[PDB]
Design a binder for this molecule. Structure first.
Ligand SMILES: CCCCCCCC/C=C\CCCCCCCC(=O)O[C@@H](COC(=O)CCCCCCCCCCCCCCC)COP(=O)([O-])OCC[N+](C)(C)C
Ligand SMILES: O=c1[nH]c2cc(C(F)(F)F)c(N3CCOCC3)cc2n(CP(=O)(O)O)c1=O
Lengths: 50, 24, 50
């Protein structure tokens, strides 16, 4: 975009300061963040003395 | 016309099954 | 802001199309939305002779 090879980058591009200094972003169309991913809590094997 | 740039990133931008048949 | 009485507004101000038309917004400093609110579940204390 800075070199003119594209007009608009409609992609999941994160609005950040470094990028913001050279291009301009629209208002966010999608807000996200860091998150935790775990395996679904499968049923436990019955313990001795259950 | 304009030059819209993106990346291959499911489900943001995904190729259809018939991408070899259709090119646009 | 629009009529010049103030030079910047730094209160919690929603970013909307109507407002964006006449003034300038920075990128969001706080993302939020509508959400549900209820009373705490209030765990029951069993009776002695329950
Ligand atoms: C013939 C054969 C012999 C048999 C002998 C039967 C004997 C009967 C004795 C029973 C004693 C009752 C104690 C008591 O009232 O418990 C109190 C707890 O408060 C305490 O913590 C109790 C303190 C220890 C009790 C010591 C004996 C609460 O009790 P409550 O207020 O009465 O309960 C109504 C409300 N509730 C159900 C929501 C709690
Ligand atoms: O820009 C805006 N920002 C706002 C920010 C807040 C809050 F976050 F709470 F501070 C509130 N509320 C104050 C008390 O009621 C609950 C929330 C209203 C706002 N409104 C008016 P609304 O659109 O009628 O809600 C705006 O217009």
């Amino acid at each position: 975009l800075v070199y003119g090879k594209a007009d608009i980058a409609i992609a999941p591009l994160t609005i950040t300061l470094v990028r913001e200094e050279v291009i301009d972003f629209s208002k966010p169309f999608m807000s996200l963040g860091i998150s935790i991913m775990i395996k679904k809590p499968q049923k436990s094997k019955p313990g001795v003395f259950s | 016309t304009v030059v819209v740039t993106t990346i291959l990133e499911s489900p943001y931008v995904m190729m259809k099954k018939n991408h070899e048949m259709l090119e646009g």
